[PDB]
Amino acid sequence: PIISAEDKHLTVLNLFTTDTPEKQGKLIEEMTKIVDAATYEGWMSSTVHSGVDSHGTLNFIQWRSGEDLEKRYAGEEFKHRTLPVFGEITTSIRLMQNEVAHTLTSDALGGKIEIGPGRDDYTVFTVFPVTPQGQDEALDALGPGQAFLAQVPGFRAHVVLKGLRARGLEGAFVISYSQWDSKQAWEAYRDQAPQDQDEARKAAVGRVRAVVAGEPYSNTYQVVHTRSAGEKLAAALEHHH
């Protein structure tokens, strides 16, 4: 699926944490059943991520509008099967509605971003709770503030999302979602010492740090499954519900 700052649809990220690799595998399988059967009006695509640094998963989902999303939330499978099943294999659930604030690619300022299991993107994710006063500052710092990323070795792309509203998370929030050549390229950047960090990096980070209002959540992922509206694709033959 394709991500761009001109997106007029709703970007939904469903974030799940868990405490064993067995529950992670189970999460992946349950998410994938829902994706493969997805026919909701307005549903555009889902991209399932499997946690690497720590146990959990992430679904990056595109919806035509919030109205379409709410219809799904009002469905009986979601209410009586999905939530309770997920509840039992997770330590937390955050269903976050966002708009795309900024994109950057290694080759173009504001370039379009593609996500999918075929790219082998090492995917890096952070949700920052921020002060309501400081939200725009955070967005500016993370997006335009980090133009330097495009020249970092192994960096592929960066999406910055503005949090609109969420289930399981209160207050203002923003999200950083980036793609890298490998775990190795990411950690080399992540772990730069002060002497090796760009000063523009220090400035961006310092601006975000000033307005963070609580513990951010970060994790890394492999993309393991993606499907779009009407796409003839599934990890299993039989419909589950």
Give residue 234's identity as a one-letter amino acid code: A
Domain residues for 22? 1-241
Q: Report the b/e string of 102-118 with b at 16+ CB within 10 A.
A: bbbbbeeeebebbbeee
- Give the determination technique: X-ray
Sequence-ordered list of residues with C-beta below 8 angstroms from that of 73, at least 6 positions apart, any chain: 79
Q: Calculate the dihedral angle through the C-alpha atoms of 201, 148, 62, 129, rounding to the nearest 10 degrees.
A: 10
Checking DSSP bridges between strand 10-17 and strand 2-3, what pairing results, if any?
unpaired
Pairwise CA distance, residues 20 & 238, whole Å: 27
Distance CA 173, CA 166 (A): 9
Q: Which two tokens stand for residue 94?
A: 């955050």
Residues in the chain: 241
State the CB neighbour count (10 A cutoff) for residue 9.
16
Q: Looking at the 3D structure of the chain, how many domains does it have?
A: 1
Nearest alpha carbon to residue 138 among 168, 171, 164, 162: 162
**What is the resolution of the experimental data for this entry, in Å?**
2.1
- DSSP symbols for 2-21: EE-TT--SEEEEEEEE-SSH
Contacts of 22 (CB under 8 A, 6+ apart): none
| Distance from C-alpha of 30 to C-alpha of 7, rounded to nearest angstrom | 28
Q: What per-residue string of b and e applies to 61-94 under the rule 16 or more CB within 10 Å gives b?
A: bbbbebebbebbeeeeeeeeebeeebeebbeebb
The alpha carbon of 70 is separated from its chain's Cα centroid by a whole number of angstroms, namely 20
SS3 category, 239: coil
Considering only the C-alpha atoms of the chain, give the largest distance between any 2 of them, rounded to a whole number of Å.
Answer: 56
DSSP label of 110: T
**127 contacts: CB under 8 Å, gap ≥ 6:** 13, 15, 94, 96, 163, 169, 173, 174, 175, 216, 217, 218
User: Cα–chain-centroid distance for residue 90?
Assistant: 17
Whether 172 contacts 163, CB under 8 Å: yes
